[PDB]
Ligand binder design. Sequence first.
Ligand SMILES: CN1C[C@H](CCn2c3c(c4ccccc42)C(=O)NCC3)CC1=O
Length: 126
Amino acid sequence: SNPPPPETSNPNKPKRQTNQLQYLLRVVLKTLWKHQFAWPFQQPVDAVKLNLPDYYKIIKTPMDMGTIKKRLENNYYWNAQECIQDFNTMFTNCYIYNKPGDDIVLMAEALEKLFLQKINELPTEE
Ligand SMILES: CN1C[C@H](CCn2c3c(c4ccccc42)C(=O)NCC3)CC1=O
């Protein structure tokens, strides 16, 4: 079976709307989401349908862009570093779980290149 997804709603978690978080949605998430290699990353890994019974034995902090998109749209975060960490966890999980050089790793690398480019120009806090 699959685990429950990561949390995307929590009324007692303090949160904010900030210009850096707005950039993470409007620039970072949107750029990666529209990419031709986004599809395997647009929702939690479904280890049942994809026949990956060891996935959640190895990956203990799952993360995906569907979860990030919900967190950004629902104003889940306090700061941009929490969201940047989610993206980095997503990429790292893929490199940890998969065999080097597999298609999925090349896909992650292409998305990560764009991510790094956009994060390099994260705007100053207003
Ligand atoms: C973020 N995700 C979603 C992947 C699911 C299974 N899946 C695998 C590959 C792949 C390529 C395209 C689409 C799905 C693919 C692949 O190239 N090698 C084996 C596992 C595993 C992973 O970490």
